[PDB]
Design a protein around this nucleic acid. Structure first.
Lengths: 126, 313
RNA sequence: AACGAGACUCUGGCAUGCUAACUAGUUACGCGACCCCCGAGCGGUCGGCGUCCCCCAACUUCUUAGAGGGACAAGUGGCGU
């Protein structure tokens, strides 16, 4: 049989979605009319195949990212995970414990005085 | 306050319902269009087994039927199509008496004048066009028109201000004088393309909506803006009630009503779940009509059905 | 990035929607003519049979052939890093 789409179809569909995302939707018969006025396509049979893969890609873009395609609506919420999160109002606080050999390393560096301490096991874990 | 309930369903179609039309002359008849190329005329009944039966079907258009409307005497109906041609039907025989030709693409909406002596149409061809009922074109709007597809055209119902209103994919609403053949006023505000425009039966207000999910109100004679209502995801169709101060909208898989005294949602209408392995699980609502009685609502869907709701206390 | 593949060109199957025909037909009648009574009923207005014959009747279903339309793995259920 074989219904795999060649690079002429797959590249033209991506370039249409990058420029005209706000015009497009789930109805094949409306996508088929939009793709005829925003582009010069030499054949009716090629126009139908391009509007078909555009209709498949719109239903994917409604769920999450597609690695070859970018839109403002998806970039500005990436820019909101970029900058600072709502997670906490202060850092994880520096009040943390110290091992006896780190206490000795800090003693030689003229520092300490703010950490609790405890010892590890009697012999190396196996 | 008042609340809706489901009455029954109508089954005789093979594609999406595109529009429904009704009159006060024949309350046992309704008329509806589809992507199956044909217009159905329904005999409604009050029998307990099924709410209606397909009585006749009109078959002459060569692609999808986009809009349908009925004469105020109930004798004739007018319709547009994706084949670019416009036709007037005798409902007694089920035959076309005249055919209108002169668009060179694809026709999206049509209307009769309030006196029923003139016809108006809009299309993907970017031109609004005016017709005599003898099938001859009388004016073309050309350069002052929308920059993109003309999505809708409507008449004001009142006689003392003879004007028409329109919306388009260039996201503008425009108002036009009939006898002077010219533009009166732009309205600007919407962010997406527009699917619909409608006017209140007292001839006072517009409503408009589309992809942005907002319904915006505007004045017809004062020429100015009124409040905005957030609908939800998308607007497919709008109508005012014939005897209450209500606006109704079809919005994705649901239908919704606002009481305009105090601006509040009265109820929202939804469908029983059929479990589906993908996004957009429910079918969408595509068109609305209130009956001439005002007490019952018809709605069309992408699953080839018309669903009927009554009002209740 | 280039050629081959695919696209591309011709062809088959669909349109009671469009354009319109005495070098293509149909229906109908002003009608006209031959044959049969088998027919409610006569040897009739009315019935049956026709590549029998006119229309200065109406039309495009059947024939021709130009323009457009239509199908995309597009819809629903499984399986797939």
């Amino acid at each position: 049989m074989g219904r795999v789409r060649t690079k002429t179809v797959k590249k033209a569909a991506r370039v249409i979605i990058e420029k005209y995302y706000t015009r497009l939707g789930n109805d094949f018969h409306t996508n088929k009319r939009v793709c005829e006025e925003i582009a010069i396509i030499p054949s009716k049979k090629l126009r139908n195949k391009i509007a078909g893969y555009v209709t498949h890609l719109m239903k994917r873009i409604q769920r999450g990212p597609v690695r070859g395609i970018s839109i403002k609506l998806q970039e500005e919420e990436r820019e909101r995970r970029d900058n600072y999160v709502p997670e906490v109002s202060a850092l994880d606080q520096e009040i943390i414990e110290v091992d006896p050999d780190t206490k000795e390393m800090l003693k030689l560096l003229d520092f300490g005085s703010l950490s609790n301490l405890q010892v590890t096991q009697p012999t190396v874990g196996m | 306050t008042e609340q809706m309930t489901l009455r029954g369903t109508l089954k005789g179609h093979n594609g999406w319902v595109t529009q429904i039309a009704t009159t006060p002359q024949f309350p046992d008849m309704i008329l509806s269009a589809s992507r199956d190329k044909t217009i159905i005329m329904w005999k409604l009944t009050r029998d307990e087994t099924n709410y209606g039966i397909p009585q006749r079907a009109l078959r002459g258009h060569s692609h999808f039927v986009s809009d349908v409307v009925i004469s105020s005497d109930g004798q004739f109906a007018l319709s547009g199509s994706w084949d670019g041609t416009l036709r007037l039907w005798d409902l007694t025989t089920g035959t076309t008496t005249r055919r209108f030709v002169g668009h060179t693409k694809d026709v999206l909406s049509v209307a009769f004048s309030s006196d029923n002596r003139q016809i108006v149409s809009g299309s993907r061809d970017k031109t609004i066009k005016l017709w005599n009922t003898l099938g001859v074109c009388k004016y073309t709007v050309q350069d002052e028109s929308h920059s993109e597809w003309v999505s809708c055209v409507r008449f004001s119902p009142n006689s003392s201000n003879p004007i028409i209103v329109s919306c388009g994919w260039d996201k503008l609403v425009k108002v036009w004088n009939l006898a002077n053949c010219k533009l009166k006023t732009n309205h600007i505000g919407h962010t997406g393309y527009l699917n619909t425009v409608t006017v209140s039966p007292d001839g006072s207000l517009c409503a408009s909506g589309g992809k942005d999910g907002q319904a915006m109100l505007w004045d017809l004679n004062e020429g100015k803006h009124l409040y905005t209502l957030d609908g939800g995801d998308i607007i497919n169709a709008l109508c005012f009630s014939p005897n209450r101060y209500w606006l109704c909208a079809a919005t994705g898989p649901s239908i919704k009503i606002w009481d305009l005294e105090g601006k509040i949602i009265v109820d929202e209408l939804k469908q029983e779940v059929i479990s589906t392995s993908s996004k957009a699980e429910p079918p969408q609502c595509t068109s609305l009509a209130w009956s001439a009685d005002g007490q019952t609502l018809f709605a069309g869907y992408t699953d080839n059905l018309v669903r009927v709701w009554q009002v209740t206390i």
